[PDB]
Amino acid sequence: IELSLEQQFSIRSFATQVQNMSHDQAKDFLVKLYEQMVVREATYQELLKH
Amino acid sequence: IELSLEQQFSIRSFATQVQNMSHDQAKDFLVKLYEQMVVREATYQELLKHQW
């Protein structure tokens, strides 16, 4: 639950780049990021269960 | 990557919701989602450590 300074820097920096995105770019990025998350969660769950 | 059928359904569900967002809604939700991904990652790292 406690984030590192580097994690916090990454989020704050991402947020500044999101503000330059068009409507179309933000939408395509959302769907791609959700897909990355769902795949990554499945990977972690497998590692944990093994 | 090759997605499972359940992943395909979840992502399509999410795509329907997104394609109906305004510019500002999509930007705001993107920053929230990225934060949630980082937090989840931190949580998983904690769970792995508490096995080994």
Side-chain angles (χ1 to χ4, degrees), chain A residues 3-50, chain B residues 3-52:
Chain A
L3 294 184
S4 69
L5 271 286
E6 302 102 87
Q7 287 166 332
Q8 297 169 79
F9 306 145
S10 177
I11 295 165
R12 294 295 210 88
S13 166
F14 188 70
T16 52
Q17 290 290 328
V18 166
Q19 281 330 293
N20 291 314
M21 288 194 188
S22 62
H23 193 182
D24 279 350
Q25 290 174 302
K27 289 192 290 188
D28 291 347
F29 208 111
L30 264 164
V31 179
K32 174 188 122 194
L33 181 69
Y34 186 78
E35 180 183 321
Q36 290 175 343
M37 289 169 66
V38 170
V39 166
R40 194 173 187 93
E41 260 232 314
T43 308
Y44 273 120
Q45 287 292 345
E46 191 55 61
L47 273 181
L48 282 161
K49 284 167 190 334
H50 204 250
Chain B
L3 297 165
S4 68
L5 196 60
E6 72 200 60
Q7 291 169 338
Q8 291 164 43
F9 269 74
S10 56
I11 297 153
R12 180 177 186 281
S13 294
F14 186 66
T16 302
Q17 298 185 77
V18 168
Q19 67 180 19
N20 290 287
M21 294 194 131
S22 69
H23 193 153
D24 284 310
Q25 282 173 333
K27 285 186 305 184
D28 293 341
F29 189 63
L30 233 202
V31 177
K32 204 253 163 234
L33 192 62
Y34 180 75
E35 178 159 25
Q36 184 185 330
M37 189 183 185
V38 176
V39 168
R40 283 179 169 184
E41 185 84 18
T43 303
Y44 277 124
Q45 281 176 227
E46 269 223 85
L47 291 171
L48 278 167
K49 180 160 92 116
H50 280 106
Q51 292 191 331
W52 301 96

PDB file of all heavy atoms in Angstrom, chain A residues 7-39:
ATOM      1  N   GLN A   7       7.987   4.925  -7.825  1.00  0.00           N
ATOM      2  CA  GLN A   7       6.580   4.632  -8.200  1.00  0.00           C
ATOM      3  C   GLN A   7       5.747   5.914  -8.290  1.00  0.00           C
ATOM      4  O   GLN A   7       5.019   6.115  -9.254  1.00  0.00           O
ATOM      5  CB  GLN A   7       5.944   3.607  -7.230  1.00  0.00           C
ATOM      6  CG  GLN A   7       6.474   2.182  -7.435  1.00  0.00           C
ATOM      7  CD  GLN A   7       6.152   1.173  -6.320  1.00  0.00           C
ATOM      8  OE1 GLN A   7       5.990   1.521  -5.159  1.00  0.00           O
ATOM      9  NE2 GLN A   7       6.102  -0.089  -6.687  1.00  0.00           N
ATOM     10  N   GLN A   8       5.898   6.814  -7.318  1.00  0.00           N
ATOM     11  CA  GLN A   8       5.133   8.054  -7.291  1.00  0.00           C
ATOM     12  C   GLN A   8       5.564   8.977  -8.429  1.00  0.00           C
ATOM     13  O   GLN A   8       4.716   9.560  -9.103  1.00  0.00           O
ATOM     14  CB  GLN A   8       5.212   8.762  -5.931  1.00  0.00           C
ATOM     15  CG  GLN A   8       4.634   7.991  -4.739  1.00  0.00           C
ATOM     16  CD  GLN A   8       5.001   8.643  -3.411  1.00  0.00           C
ATOM     17  OE1 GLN A   8       4.382   9.625  -3.026  1.00  0.00           O
ATOM     18  NE2 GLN A   8       6.014   8.120  -2.726  1.00  0.00           N
ATOM     19  N   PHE A   9       6.870   9.085  -8.666  1.00  0.00           N
ATOM     20  CA  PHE A   9       7.417   9.812  -9.824  1.00  0.00           C
ATOM     21  C   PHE A   9       6.827   9.253 -11.120  1.00  0.00           C
ATOM     22  O   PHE A   9       6.514  10.043 -11.989  1.00  0.00           O
ATOM     23  CB  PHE A   9       8.946   9.842  -9.901  1.00  0.00           C
ATOM     24  CG  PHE A   9       9.635  10.360  -8.659  1.00  0.00           C
ATOM     25  CD1 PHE A   9      10.853   9.818  -8.265  1.00  0.00           C
ATOM     26  CD2 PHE A   9       9.087  11.391  -7.896  1.00  0.00           C
ATOM     27  CE1 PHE A   9      11.483  10.276  -7.137  1.00  0.00           C
ATOM     28  CE2 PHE A   9       9.737  11.857  -6.774  1.00  0.00           C
ATOM     29  CZ  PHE A   9      10.922  11.299  -6.390  1.00  0.00           C
ATOM     30  N   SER A  10       6.704   7.929 -11.261  1.00  0.00           N
ATOM     31  CA  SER A  10       6.233   7.333 -12.507  1.00  0.00           C
ATOM     32  C   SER A  10       4.786   7.750 -12.788  1.00  0.00           C
ATOM     33  O   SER A  10       4.443   7.986 -13.938  1.00  0.00           O
ATOM     34  CB  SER A  10       6.308   5.785 -12.497  1.00  0.00           C
ATOM     35  OG  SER A  10       5.793   5.229 -13.692  1.00  0.00           O
ATOM     36  N   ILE A  11       3.956   7.800 -11.744  1.00  0.00           N
ATOM     37  CA  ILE A  11       2.527   8.124 -11.843  1.00  0.00           C
ATOM     38  C   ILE A  11       2.368   9.603 -12.188  1.00  0.00           C
ATOM     39  O   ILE A  11       1.666   9.965 -13.113  1.00  0.00           O
ATOM     40  CB  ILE A  11       1.799   7.799 -10.487  1.00  0.00           C
ATOM     41  CG1 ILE A  11       1.824   6.291 -10.207  1.00  0.00           C
ATOM     42  CG2 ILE A  11       0.347   8.360 -10.485  1.00  0.00           C
ATOM     43  CD1 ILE A  11       1.464   5.911  -8.769  1.00  0.00           C
ATOM     44  N   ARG A  12       3.040  10.450 -11.431  1.00  0.00           N
ATOM     45  CA  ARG A  12       3.042  11.892 -11.713  1.00  0.00           C
ATOM     46  C   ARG A  12       3.549  12.200 -13.125  1.00  0.00           C
ATOM     47  O   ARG A  12       2.954  13.033 -13.784  1.00  0.00           O
ATOM     48  CB  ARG A  12       3.840  12.673 -10.670  1.00  0.00           C
ATOM     49  CG  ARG A  12       3.234  12.654  -9.276  1.00  0.00           C
ATOM     50  CD  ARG A  12       1.879  13.341  -9.136  1.00  0.00           C
ATOM     51  NE  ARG A  12       1.749  13.886  -7.785  1.00  0.00           N
ATOM     52  CZ  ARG A  12       2.157  15.092  -7.378  1.00  0.00           C
ATOM     53  NH1 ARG A  12       2.733  15.960  -8.209  1.00  0.00           N
ATOM     54  NH2 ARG A  12       1.986  15.439  -6.105  1.00  0.00           N
ATOM     55  N   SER A  13       4.597  11.521 -13.604  1.00  0.00           N
ATOM     56  CA  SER A  13       5.107  11.740 -14.960  1.00  0.00           C
ATOM     57  C   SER A  13       4.138  11.243 -16.052  1.00  0.00           C
ATOM     58  O   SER A  13       3.863  11.947 -17.011  1.00  0.00           O
ATOM     59  CB  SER A  13       6.474  11.093 -15.140  1.00  0.00           C
ATOM     60  OG  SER A  13       6.812  11.036 -16.509  1.00  0.00           O
ATOM     61  N   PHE A  14       3.627  10.024 -15.913  1.00  0.00           N
ATOM     62  CA  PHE A  14       2.501   9.567 -16.728  1.00  0.00           C
ATOM     63  C   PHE A  14       1.360  10.567 -16.819  1.00  0.00           C
ATOM     64  O   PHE A  14       0.869  10.831 -17.909  1.00  0.00           O
ATOM     65  CB  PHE A  14       1.970   8.256 -16.185  1.00  0.00           C
ATOM     66  CG  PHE A  14       0.948   7.621 -17.050  1.00  0.00           C
ATOM     67  CD1 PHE A  14       1.308   7.071 -18.272  1.00  0.00           C
ATOM     68  CD2 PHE A  14      -0.372   7.575 -16.651  1.00  0.00           C
ATOM     69  CE1 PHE A  14       0.354   6.472 -19.087  1.00  0.00           C
ATOM     70  CE2 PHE A  14      -1.330   6.954 -17.449  1.00  0.00           C
ATOM     71  CZ  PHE A  14      -0.955   6.394 -18.661  1.00  0.00           C
ATOM     72  N   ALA A  15       0.924  11.118 -15.693  1.00  0.00           N
ATOM     73  CA  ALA A  15      -0.184  12.074 -15.694  1.00  0.00           C
ATOM     74  C   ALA A  15       0.132  13.295 -16.550  1.00  0.00           C
ATOM     75  O   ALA A  15      -0.753  13.785 -17.253  1.00  0.00           O
ATOM     76  CB  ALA A  15      -0.563  12.528 -14.267  1.00  0.00           C
ATOM     77  N   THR A  16       1.365  13.785 -16.517  1.00  0.00           N
ATOM     78  CA  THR A  16       1.704  14.948 -17.342  1.00  0.00           C
ATOM     79  C   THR A  16       1.664  14.611 -18.829  1.00  0.00           C
ATOM     80  O   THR A  16       1.227  15.449 -19.606  1.00  0.00           O
ATOM     81  CB  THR A  16       3.083  15.615 -16.972  1.00  0.00           C
ATOM     82  OG1 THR A  16       4.126  14.637 -16.951  1.00  0.00           O
ATOM     83  CG2 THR A  16       3.052  16.157 -15.556  1.00  0.00           C
ATOM     84  N   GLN A  17       2.094  13.413 -19.232  1.00  0.00           N
ATOM     85  CA  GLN A  17       2.008  13.003 -20.641  1.00  0.00           C
ATOM     86  C   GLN A  17       0.563  12.725 -21.099  1.00  0.00           C
ATOM     87  O   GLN A  17       0.261  12.871 -22.292  1.00  0.00           O
ATOM     88  CB  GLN A  17       2.888  11.769 -20.934  1.00  0.00           C
ATOM     89  CG  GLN A  17       4.431  11.994 -20.896  1.00  0.00           C
ATOM     90  CD  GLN A  17       5.000  12.850 -22.048  1.00  0.00           C
ATOM     91  OE1 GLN A  17       4.483  12.843 -23.172  1.00  0.00           O
ATOM     92  NE2 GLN A  17       6.079  13.585 -21.761  1.00  0.00           N
ATOM     93  N   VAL A  18      -0.313  12.299 -20.180  1.00  0.00           N
ATOM     94  CA  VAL A  18      -1.714  12.066 -20.500  1.00  0.00           C
ATOM     95  C   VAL A  18      -2.393  13.371 -20.888  1.00  0.00           C
ATOM     96  O   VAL A  18      -3.272  13.372 -21.738  1.00  0.00           O
ATOM     97  CB  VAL A  18      -2.489  11.344 -19.346  1.00  0.00           C
ATOM     98  CG1 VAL A  18      -3.980  11.417 -19.538  1.00  0.00           C
ATOM     99  CG2 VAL A  18      -2.036   9.909 -19.219  1.00  0.00           C
ATOM    100  N   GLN A  19      -1.999  14.476 -20.269  1.00  0.00           N
ATOM    101  CA  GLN A  19      -2.596  15.767 -20.587  1.00  0.00           C
ATOM    102  C   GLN A  19      -2.309  16.271 -22.007  1.00  0.00           C
ATOM    103  O   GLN A  19      -3.043  17.125 -22.491  1.00  0.00           O
ATOM    104  CB  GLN A  19      -2.247  16.812 -19.506  1.00  0.00           C
ATOM    105  CG  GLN A  19      -3.097  16.703 -18.204  1.00  0.00           C
ATOM    106  CD  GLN A  19      -4.536  16.147 -18.394  1.00  0.00           C
ATOM    107  OE1 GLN A  19      -5.397  16.786 -19.029  1.00  0.00           O
ATOM    108  NE2 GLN A  19      -4.789  14.963 -17.842  1.00  0.00           N
ATOM    109  N   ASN A  20      -1.268  15.750 -22.666  1.00  0.00           N
ATOM    110  CA  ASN A  20      -1.014  16.021 -24.095  1.00  0.00           C
ATOM    111  C   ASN A  20      -1.746  15.104 -25.097  1.00  0.00           C
ATOM    112  O   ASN A  20      -1.675  15.304 -26.312  1.00  0.00           O
ATOM    113  CB  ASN A  20       0.496  15.966 -24.370  1.00  0.00           C
ATOM    114  CG  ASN A  20       1.229  17.117 -23.735  1.00  0.00           C
ATOM    115  OD1 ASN A  20       0.794  18.255 -23.841  1.00  0.00           O
ATOM    116  ND2 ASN A  20       2.333  16.830 -23.057  1.00  0.00           N
ATOM    117  N   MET A  21      -2.452  14.107 -24.598  1.00  0.00           N
ATOM    118  CA  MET A  21      -3.094  13.134 -25.471  1.00  0.00           C
ATOM    119  C   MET A  21      -4.372  13.721 -26.051  1.00  0.00           C
ATOM    120  O   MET A  21      -5.063  14.478 -25.387  1.00  0.00           O
ATOM    121  CB  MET A  21      -3.424  11.856 -24.710  1.00  0.00           C
ATOM    122  CG  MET A  21      -2.194  11.042 -24.380  1.00  0.00           C
ATOM    123  SD  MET A  21      -2.623   9.253 -23.801  1.00  0.00           S
ATOM    124  CE  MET A  21      -0.813   8.772 -23.288  1.00  0.00           C
ATOM    125  N   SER A  22      -4.688  13.341 -27.280  1.00  0.00           N
ATOM    126  CA  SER A  22      -5.969  13.659 -27.899  1.00  0.00           C
ATOM    127  C   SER A  22      -7.028  12.733 -27.304  1.00  0.00           C
ATOM    128  O   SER A  22      -6.728  11.833 -26.505  1.00  0.00           O
ATOM    129  CB  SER A  22      -5.910  13.449 -29.421  1.00  0.00           C
ATOM    130  OG  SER A  22      -5.648  12.079 -29.711  1.00  0.00           O
ATOM    131  N   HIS A  23      -8.267  12.962 -27.703  1.00  0.00           N
ATOM    132  CA  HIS A  23      -9.365  12.072 -27.305  1.00  0.00           C
ATOM    133  C   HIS A  23      -9.131  10.656 -27.816  1.00  0.00           C
ATOM    134  O   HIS A  23      -9.200   9.679 -27.041  1.00  0.00           O
ATOM    135  CB  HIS A  23     -10.677  12.654 -27.831  1.00  0.00           C
ATOM    136  CG  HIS A  23     -11.906  12.037 -27.242  1.00  0.00           C
ATOM    137  ND1 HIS A  23     -13.171  12.420 -27.626  1.00  0.00           N
ATOM    138  CD2 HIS A  23     -12.076  11.084 -26.298  1.00  0.00           C
ATOM    139  CE1 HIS A  23     -14.068  11.724 -26.950  1.00  0.00           C
ATOM    140  NE2 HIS A  23     -13.427  10.920 -26.122  1.00  0.00           N
ATOM    141  N   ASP A  24      -8.855  10.523 -29.110  1.00  0.00           N
ATOM    142  CA  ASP A  24      -8.563   9.209 -29.695  1.00  0.00           C
ATOM    143  C   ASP A  24      -7.371   8.497 -29.042  1.00  0.00           C
ATOM    144  O   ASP A  24      -7.459   7.303 -28.730  1.00  0.00           O
ATOM    145  CB  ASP A  24      -8.357   9.302 -31.220  1.00  0.00           C
ATOM    146  CG  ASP A  24      -9.672   9.351 -32.005  1.00  0.00           C
ATOM    147  OD1 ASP A  24     -10.771   9.132 -31.432  1.00  0.00           O
ATOM    148  OD2 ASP A  24      -9.690   9.610 -33.231  1.00  0.00           O
ATOM    149  N   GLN A  25      -6.272   9.210 -28.797  1.00  0.00           N
ATOM    150  CA  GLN A  25      -5.112   8.599 -28.125  1.00  0.00           C
ATOM    151  C   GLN A  25      -5.392   8.088 -26.698  1.00  0.00           C
ATOM    152  O   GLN A  25      -4.892   7.041 -26.300  1.00  0.00           O
ATOM    153  CB  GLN A  25      -3.925   9.557 -28.076  1.00  0.00           C
ATOM    154  CG  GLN A  25      -3.287   9.813 -29.440  1.00  0.00           C
ATOM    155  CD  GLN A  25      -2.217  10.884 -29.370  1.00  0.00           C
ATOM    156  OE1 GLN A  25      -2.496  11.996 -28.957  1.00  0.00           O
ATOM    157  NE2 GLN A  25      -0.995  10.540 -29.739  1.00  0.00           N
ATOM    158  N   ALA A  26      -6.143   8.851 -25.917  1.00  0.00           N
ATOM    159  CA  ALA A  26      -6.452   8.487 -24.546  1.00  0.00           C
ATOM    160  C   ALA A  26      -7.327   7.263 -24.510  1.00  0.00           C
ATOM    161  O   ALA A  26      -7.133   6.382 -23.659  1.00  0.00           O
ATOM    162  CB  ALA A  26      -7.093   9.652 -23.798  1.00  0.00           C
ATOM    163  N   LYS A  27      -8.280   7.184 -25.441  1.00  0.00           N
ATOM    164  CA  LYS A  27      -9.131   6.012 -25.553  1.00  0.00           C
ATOM    165  C   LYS A  27      -8.391   4.736 -25.974  1.00  0.00           C
ATOM    166  O   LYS A  27      -8.598   3.690 -25.371  1.00  0.00           O
ATOM    167  CB  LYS A  27     -10.331   6.284 -26.460  1.00  0.00           C
ATOM    168  CG  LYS A  27     -11.355   7.236 -25.806  1.00  0.00           C
ATOM    169  CD  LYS A  27     -12.683   7.280 -26.558  1.00  0.00           C
ATOM    170  CE  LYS A  27     -12.553   7.971 -27.885  1.00  0.00           C
ATOM    171  NZ  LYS A  27     -13.876   8.173 -28.529  1.00  0.00           N
ATOM    172  N   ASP A  28      -7.549   4.815 -26.997  1.00  0.00           N
ATOM    173  CA  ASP A  28      -6.737   3.660 -27.415  1.00  0.00           C
ATOM    174  C   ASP A  28      -5.776   3.214 -26.322  1.00  0.00           C
ATOM    175  O   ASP A  28      -5.649   2.015 -26.073  1.00  0.00           O
ATOM    176  CB  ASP A  28      -5.968   3.952 -28.719  1.00  0.00           C
ATOM    177  CG  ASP A  28      -6.896   4.076 -29.957  1.00  0.00           C
ATOM    178  OD1 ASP A  28      -8.095   3.706 -29.894  1.00  0.00           O
ATOM    179  OD2 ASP A  28      -6.503   4.543 -31.055  1.00  0.00           O
ATOM    180  N   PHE A  29      -5.107   4.169 -25.659  1.00  0.00           N
ATOM    181  CA  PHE A  29      -4.243   3.879 -24.536  1.00  0.00           C
ATOM    182  C   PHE A  29      -5.001   3.215 -23.402  1.00  0.00           C
ATOM    183  O   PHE A  29      -4.501   2.249 -22.874  1.00  0.00           O
ATOM    184  CB  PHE A  29      -3.493   5.130 -24.017  1.00  0.00           C
ATOM    185  CG  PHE A  29      -2.172   4.821 -23.362  1.00  0.00           C
ATOM    186  CD1 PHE A  29      -0.982   5.192 -23.978  1.00  0.00           C
ATOM    187  CD2 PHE A  29      -2.101   4.172 -22.137  1.00  0.00           C
ATOM    188  CE1 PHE A  29       0.242   4.921 -23.385  1.00  0.00           C
ATOM    189  CE2 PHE A  29      -0.875   3.896 -21.540  1.00  0.00           C
ATOM    190  CZ  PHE A  29       0.287   4.277 -22.158  1.00  0.00           C
ATOM    191  N   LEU A  30      -6.196   3.687 -23.041  1.00  0.00           N
ATOM    192  CA  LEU A  30      -6.993   3.021 -21.996  1.00  0.00           C
ATOM    193  C   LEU A  30      -7.245   1.569 -22.217  1.00  0.00           C
ATOM    194  O   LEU A  30      -7.062   0.785 -21.278  1.00  0.00           O
ATOM    195  CB  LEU A  30      -8.372   3.631 -21.830  1.00  0.00           C
ATOM    196  CG  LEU A  30      -8.534   4.668 -20.749  1.00  0.00           C
ATOM    197  CD1 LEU A  30      -9.855   5.455 -20.979  1.00  0.00           C
ATOM    198  CD2 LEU A  30      -8.358   4.088 -19.357  1.00  0.00           C
ATOM    199  N   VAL A  31      -7.689   1.214 -23.430  1.00  0.00           N
ATOM    200  CA  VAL A  31      -8.018  -0.161 -23.725  1.00  0.00           C
ATOM    201  C   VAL A  31      -6.735  -1.001 -23.734  1.00  0.00           C
ATOM    202  O   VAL A  31      -6.739  -2.152 -23.311  1.00  0.00           O
ATOM    203  CB  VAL A  31      -8.879  -0.341 -25.020  1.00  0.00           C
ATOM    204  CG1 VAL A  31      -9.168  -1.788 -25.281  1.00  0.00           C
ATOM    205  CG2 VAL A  31     -10.195   0.346 -24.858  1.00  0.00           C
ATOM    206  N   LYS A  32      -5.636  -0.442 -24.210  1.00  0.00           N
ATOM    207  CA  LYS A  32      -4.380  -1.181 -24.261  1.00  0.00           C
ATOM    208  C   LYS A  32      -3.856  -1.399 -22.868  1.00  0.00           C
ATOM    209  O   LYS A  32      -3.343  -2.461 -22.597  1.00  0.00           O
ATOM    210  CB  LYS A  32      -3.361  -0.416 -25.134  1.00  0.00           C
ATOM    211  CG  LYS A  32      -1.918  -0.987 -25.173  1.00  0.00           C
ATOM    212  CD  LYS A  32      -0.945  -0.026 -25.906  1.00  0.00           C
ATOM    213  CE  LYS A  32       0.246   0.418 -25.032  1.00  0.00           C
ATOM    214  NZ  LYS A  32       1.004   1.591 -25.606  1.00  0.00           N
ATOM    215  N   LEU A  33      -3.967  -0.398 -21.989  1.00  0.00           N
ATOM    216  CA  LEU A  33      -3.458  -0.499 -20.607  1.00  0.00           C
ATOM    217  C   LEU A  33      -4.283  -1.502 -19.819  1.00  0.00           C
ATOM    218  O   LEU A  33      -3.726  -2.317 -19.097  1.00  0.00           O
ATOM    219  CB  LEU A  33      -3.486   0.866 -19.918  1.00  0.00           C
ATOM    220  CG  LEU A  33      -2.951   0.910 -18.488  1.00  0.00           C
ATOM    221  CD1 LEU A  33      -1.450   0.672 -18.525  1.00  0.00           C
ATOM    222  CD2 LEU A  33      -3.310   2.230 -17.842  1.00  0.00           C
ATOM    223  N   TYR A  34      -5.610  -1.499 -19.991  1.00  0.00           N
ATOM    224  CA  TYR A  34      -6.457  -2.486 -19.348  1.00  0.00           C
ATOM    225  C   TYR A  34      -6.065  -3.899 -19.769  1.00  0.00           C
ATOM    226  O   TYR A  34      -5.963  -4.768 -18.928  1.00  0.00           O
ATOM    227  CB  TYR A  34      -7.940  -2.218 -19.670  1.00  0.00           C
ATOM    228  CG  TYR A  34      -8.876  -3.123 -18.912  1.00  0.00           C
ATOM    229  CD1 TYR A  34      -9.171  -2.872 -17.582  1.00  0.00           C
ATOM    230  CD2 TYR A  34      -9.487  -4.217 -19.517  1.00  0.00           C
ATOM    231  CE1 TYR A  34     -10.044  -3.706 -16.867  1.00  0.00           C
ATOM    232  CE2 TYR A  34     -10.366  -5.035 -18.809  1.00  0.00           C
ATOM    233  CZ  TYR A  34     -10.639  -4.769 -17.498  1.00  0.00           C
ATOM    234  OH  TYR A  34     -11.466  -5.591 -16.788  1.00  0.00           O
ATOM    235  N   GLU A  35      -5.858  -4.130 -21.072  1.00  0.00           N
ATOM    236  CA  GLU A  35      -5.416  -5.417 -21.545  1.00  0.00           C
ATOM    237  C   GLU A  35      -4.071  -5.824 -20.879  1.00  0.00           C
ATOM    238  O   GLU A  35      -3.945  -6.962 -20.455  1.00  0.00           O
ATOM    239  CB  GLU A  35      -5.283  -5.457 -23.068  1.00  0.00           C
ATOM    240  CG  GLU A  35      -4.825  -6.798 -23.561  1.00  0.00           C
ATOM    241  CD  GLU A  35      -4.621  -6.842 -25.037  1.00  0.00           C
ATOM    242  OE1 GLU A  35      -5.417  -6.245 -25.765  1.00  0.00           O
ATOM    243  OE2 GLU A  35      -3.646  -7.488 -25.452  1.00  0.00           O
ATOM    244  N   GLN A  36      -3.099  -4.913 -20.812  1.00  0.00           N
ATOM    245  CA  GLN A  36      -1.815  -5.205 -20.176  1.00  0.00           C
ATOM    246  C   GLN A  36      -2.021  -5.627 -18.726  1.00  0.00           C
ATOM    247  O   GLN A  36      -1.390  -6.556 -18.260  1.00  0.00           O
ATOM    248  CB  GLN A  36      -0.900  -3.989 -20.286  1.00  0.00           C
ATOM    249  CG  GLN A  36      -0.431  -3.734 -21.734  1.00  0.00           C
ATOM    250  CD  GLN A  36       0.385  -2.471 -21.933  1.00  0.00           C
ATOM    251  OE1 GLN A  36       0.385  -1.573 -21.097  1.00  0.00           O
ATOM    252  NE2 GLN A  36       1.112  -2.419 -23.044  1.00  0.00           N
ATOM    253  N   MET A  37      -2.892  -4.937 -18.009  1.00  0.00           N
ATOM    254  CA  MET A  37      -3.222  -5.244 -16.621  1.00  0.00           C
ATOM    255  C   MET A  37      -3.842  -6.608 -16.429  1.00  0.00           C
ATOM    256  O   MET A  37      -3.447  -7.315 -15.498  1.00  0.00           O
ATOM    257  CB  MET A  37      -4.183  -4.233 -16.040  1.00  0.00           C
ATOM    258  CG  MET A  37      -3.491  -2.955 -15.839  1.00  0.00           C
ATOM    259  SD  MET A  37      -4.647  -1.484 -15.430  1.00  0.00           S
ATOM    260  CE  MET A  37      -5.222  -2.104 -13.828  1.00  0.00           C
ATOM    261  N   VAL A  38      -4.785  -6.985 -17.289  1.00  0.00           N
ATOM    262  CA  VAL A  38      -5.435  -8.246 -17.137  1.00  0.00           C
ATOM    263  C   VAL A  38      -4.452  -9.387 -17.392  1.00  0.00           C
ATOM    264  O   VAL A  38      -4.472 -10.380 -16.697  1.00  0.00           O
ATOM    265  CB  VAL A  38      -6.616  -8.372 -18.141  1.00  0.00           C
ATOM    266  CG1 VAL A  38      -7.115  -9.751 -18.133  1.00  0.00           C
ATOM    267  CG2 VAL A  38      -7.758  -7.437 -17.707  1.00  0.00           C
ATOM    268  N   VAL A  39      -3.591  -9.239 -18.384  1.00  0.00           N
ATOM    269  CA  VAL A  39      -2.549 -10.261 -18.674  1.00  0.00           C
ATOM    270  C   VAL A  39      -1.504 -10.365 -17.527  1.00  0.00           C
ATOM    271  O   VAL A  39      -1.164 -11.447 -17.065  1.00  0.00           O
ATOM    272  CB  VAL A  39      -1.933  -9.953 -20.033  1.00  0.00           C
ATOM    273  CG1 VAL A  39      -0.622 -10.714 -20.287  1.00  0.00           C
ATOM    274  CG2 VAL A  39      -2.945 -10.204 -21.177  1.00  0.00           C
TER     275      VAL A  39
END
